[PDB]
Amino acid sequence: ARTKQTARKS
Amino acid sequence: PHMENEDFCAVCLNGGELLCCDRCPKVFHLSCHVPALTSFPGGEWVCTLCRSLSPGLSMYDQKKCEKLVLSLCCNNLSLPFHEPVSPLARHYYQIIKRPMDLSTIRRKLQKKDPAHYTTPEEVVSDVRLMFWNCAKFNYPDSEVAEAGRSLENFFEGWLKEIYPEKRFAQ
Ligand SMILES: [Zn+2]
Ligand SMILES: [Zn+2]
């Protein structure tokens, strides 16, 4: 599967 | 970067570590998908919305009810109903004596739960309780009441599509 890593909101 | 997929979890709209659907652009936190995942799967993965179709629900009804509930969760109008109302909110729990939210509905889709759904009828009843509580507590002209009414219209559409052979009372 493909995984995406973005920044969480804060 | 996987730009063919969205950048925010379809359910909670936050970023982070996201699993990509291989048939639609949606992405999901492992725990936000319905049913939740405990690890990233190997090989191809298709989300519950893109999938084709004895305690607990039958496996037929389990897949349909998962599609119904995830459809609600991914609609952004559902965001006010994902979590229980803040126990600090004014008068809510004096007015609403049987609260219901989508995190509770998701938990009861699991046959390990002591209150697990055994029929689609019980699922639909809890969704309609959510809409009923929204209409009772919030003034009809408010933004939350309007989101509730619109999301209910979406939900009745999905019921006819996923369960055409069934009509759910009231
Ligand atoms: Zn999420
Ligand atoms: Zn998908």
Short mmCIF file of C-alpha atoms and ligand atoms in Angstrom, two decimals:
data_model
loop_
_atom_site.label_atom_id
_atom_site.label_comp_id
_atom_site.label_asym_id
_atom_site.label_seq_id
_atom_site.Cartn_x
_atom_site.Cartn_y
_atom_site.Cartn_z
CA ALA A 1 0.00 0.00 0.00
CA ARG A 2 1.03 3.63 -0.43
CA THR A 3 1.53 5.85 2.60
CA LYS A 4 1.54 9.64 2.65
CA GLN A 5 3.13 11.64 5.46
CA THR A 6 1.94 15.23 5.86
CA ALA A 7 2.13 17.60 8.80
CA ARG A 8 -0.65 17.60 11.37
CA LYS A 9 -2.59 20.78 12.04
CA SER A 10 -1.60 22.98 15.00
CA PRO B 1 4.32 12.45 -2.55
CA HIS B 2 1.38 10.56 -4.12
CA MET B 3 -0.36 13.65 -5.45
CA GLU B 4 -3.08 11.52 -7.05
CA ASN B 5 -4.39 11.17 -3.48
CA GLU B 6 -5.75 13.77 -1.10
CA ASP B 7 -3.64 15.42 1.62
CA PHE B 8 -6.06 15.22 4.58
CA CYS B 9 -7.81 12.21 6.14
CA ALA B 10 -11.23 11.83 4.53
CA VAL B 11 -12.80 11.32 7.98
CA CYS B 12 -11.08 13.68 10.45
CA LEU B 13 -9.51 16.11 7.92
CA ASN B 14 -6.14 16.10 9.70
CA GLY B 15 -2.76 15.34 8.19
CA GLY B 16 -0.21 12.86 9.51
CA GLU B 17 0.51 9.26 8.53
CA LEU B 18 -2.09 8.46 5.87
CA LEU B 19 -3.01 5.31 3.95
CA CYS B 20 -3.94 5.90 0.29
CA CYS B 21 -6.86 4.28 -1.50
CA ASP B 22 -5.82 2.76 -4.82
CA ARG B 23 -9.22 3.33 -6.47
CA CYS B 24 -10.18 6.79 -5.27
CA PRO B 25 -8.25 9.87 -4.08
CA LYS B 26 -9.23 9.49 -0.42
CA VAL B 27 -6.65 8.85 2.31
CA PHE B 28 -7.23 7.65 5.86
CA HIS B 29 -5.57 7.38 9.22
CA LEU B 30 -5.38 3.69 10.04
CA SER B 31 -7.81 4.26 12.89
CA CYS B 32 -10.18 6.54 10.93
CA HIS B 33 -11.04 4.00 8.25
CA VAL B 34 -14.11 1.83 8.78
CA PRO B 35 -13.23 -0.88 9.76
CA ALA B 36 -10.10 0.45 11.48
CA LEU B 37 -6.75 -1.00 10.50
CA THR B 38 -4.05 -1.95 12.99
CA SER B 39 -1.09 -1.85 10.58
CA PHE B 40 -0.39 -0.68 7.06
CA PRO B 41 -1.36 -3.50 4.67
CA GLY B 42 0.93 -5.07 2.13
CA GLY B 43 0.21 -4.75 -1.54
CA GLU B 44 -2.80 -3.02 -2.99
CA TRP B 45 -5.42 -1.48 -0.72
CA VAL B 46 -8.95 -0.34 -1.57
CA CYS B 47 -11.02 1.64 0.92
CA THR B 48 -14.45 0.53 2.09
CA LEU B 49 -16.20 3.06 -0.13
CA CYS B 50 -14.58 1.57 -3.28
CA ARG B 51 -15.10 -2.11 -2.39
CA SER B 52 -17.56 -4.29 -4.25
CA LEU B 53 -20.00 -6.48 -2.34
CA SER B 54 -23.12 -16.35 13.41
CA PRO B 55 -23.02 -13.51 15.97
CA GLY B 56 -22.98 -9.87 14.94
CA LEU B 57 -24.07 -8.83 11.48
CA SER B 58 -23.95 -11.21 8.55
CA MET B 59 -20.92 -10.55 6.36
CA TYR B 60 -23.25 -9.11 3.70
CA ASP B 61 -24.83 -6.63 6.11
CA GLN B 62 -21.47 -5.93 7.74
CA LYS B 63 -20.00 -4.65 4.48
CA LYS B 64 -23.10 -2.64 3.60
CA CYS B 65 -23.34 -1.03 7.04
CA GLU B 66 -19.62 -0.24 7.00
CA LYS B 67 -20.11 1.50 3.65
CA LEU B 68 -23.14 3.39 5.04
CA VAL B 69 -21.33 4.59 8.16
CA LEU B 70 -18.07 5.50 6.41
CA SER B 71 -20.11 7.42 3.83
CA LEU B 72 -21.58 9.48 6.66
CA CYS B 73 -18.19 9.96 8.32
CA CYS B 74 -16.45 11.14 5.15
CA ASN B 75 -19.13 13.73 4.38
CA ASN B 76 -17.79 16.95 5.92
CA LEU B 77 -21.26 17.89 7.18
CA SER B 78 -20.87 15.01 9.67
CA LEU B 79 -17.93 16.61 11.52
CA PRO B 80 -20.08 18.03 14.39
CA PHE B 81 -21.36 14.50 15.08
CA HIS B 82 -18.10 12.53 15.08
CA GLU B 83 -17.50 12.88 18.83
CA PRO B 84 -19.73 13.24 21.89
CA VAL B 85 -20.67 16.78 22.76
CA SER B 86 -18.27 18.33 25.29
CA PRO B 87 -19.60 17.41 28.78
CA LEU B 88 -18.84 21.09 29.53
CA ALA B 89 -21.42 22.24 26.94
CA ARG B 90 -24.40 24.18 28.25
CA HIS B 91 -27.50 22.09 29.06
CA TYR B 92 -26.81 19.48 26.37
CA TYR B 93 -26.92 16.48 28.67
CA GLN B 94 -29.94 17.86 30.57
CA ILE B 95 -31.86 17.95 27.26
CA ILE B 96 -30.42 14.94 25.41
CA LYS B 97 -30.86 11.84 27.59
CA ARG B 98 -29.79 9.31 24.89
CA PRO B 99 -26.77 10.88 23.18
CA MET B 100 -25.37 9.32 20.01
CA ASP B 101 -22.36 10.09 17.83
CA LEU B 102 -20.52 8.47 14.99
CA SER B 103 -17.68 7.19 17.14
CA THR B 104 -20.21 5.17 19.14
CA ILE B 105 -21.84 3.87 15.95
CA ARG B 106 -18.43 2.83 14.62
CA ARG B 107 -17.67 1.00 17.88
CA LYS B 108 -20.97 -0.92 17.75
CA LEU B 109 -20.25 -2.21 14.24
CA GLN B 110 -17.67 -4.47 15.97
CA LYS B 111 -19.20 -7.79 17.04
CA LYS B 112 -16.92 -7.78 20.11
CA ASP B 113 -18.84 -4.81 21.54
CA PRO B 114 -21.35 -5.70 24.30
CA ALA B 115 -23.96 -3.55 22.51
CA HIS B 116 -23.01 -4.57 18.96
CA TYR B 117 -25.51 -4.20 16.13
CA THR B 118 -27.11 -7.46 15.03
CA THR B 119 -29.24 -6.00 12.18
CA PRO B 120 -29.01 -3.05 9.76
CA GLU B 121 -32.24 -1.84 11.38
CA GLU B 122 -30.35 -1.18 14.63
CA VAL B 123 -27.66 0.76 12.74
CA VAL B 124 -30.23 2.95 10.98
CA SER B 125 -32.03 3.55 14.28
CA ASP B 126 -28.85 4.91 15.92
CA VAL B 127 -28.08 7.15 12.94
CA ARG B 128 -31.62 8.53 13.11
CA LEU B 129 -31.23 9.10 16.87
CA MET B 130 -28.22 11.23 16.05
CA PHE B 131 -30.32 13.35 13.69
CA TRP B 132 -33.15 13.45 16.21
CA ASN B 133 -30.85 14.73 18.96
CA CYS B 134 -29.40 17.36 16.64
CA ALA B 135 -32.87 18.69 15.77
CA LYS B 136 -34.04 18.68 19.41
CA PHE B 137 -31.04 20.49 20.88
CA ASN B 138 -30.07 22.98 18.19
CA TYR B 139 -32.35 25.77 17.06
CA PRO B 140 -33.61 25.04 13.52
CA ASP B 141 -32.02 28.14 11.97
CA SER B 142 -28.54 27.33 13.33
CA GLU B 143 -25.64 26.14 11.19
CA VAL B 144 -25.44 22.84 13.07
CA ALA B 145 -29.14 22.08 12.66
CA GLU B 146 -28.88 22.78 8.92
CA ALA B 147 -25.86 20.50 8.57
CA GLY B 148 -27.84 17.82 10.39
CA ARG B 149 -30.84 18.18 8.08
CA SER B 150 -28.67 18.14 4.97
CA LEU B 151 -26.63 15.16 6.16
CA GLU B 152 -29.89 13.32 6.83
CA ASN B 153 -30.90 13.93 3.20
CA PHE B 154 -27.56 12.45 2.11
CA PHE B 155 -28.12 9.47 4.40
CA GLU B 156 -31.61 8.71 3.12
CA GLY B 157 -30.14 8.71 -0.39
CA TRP B 158 -27.49 6.17 0.60
CA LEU B 159 -30.08 3.95 2.30
CA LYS B 160 -32.04 3.60 -0.93
CA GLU B 161 -28.82 2.87 -2.85
CA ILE B 162 -27.27 0.34 -0.45
CA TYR B 163 -30.47 -1.25 0.91
CA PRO B 164 -32.98 -0.90 -1.94
CA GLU B 165 -34.68 -4.13 -0.86
CA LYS B 166 -35.33 -2.70 2.63
CA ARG B 167 -37.42 0.19 3.94
CA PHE B 168 -36.66 1.31 7.50
CA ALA B 169 -39.64 2.41 9.60
CA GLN B 170 -39.90 6.11 10.51
ZN ZN C 1 -8.19 10.68 10.33
ZN ZN C 2 -11.47 4.54 -2.22
#
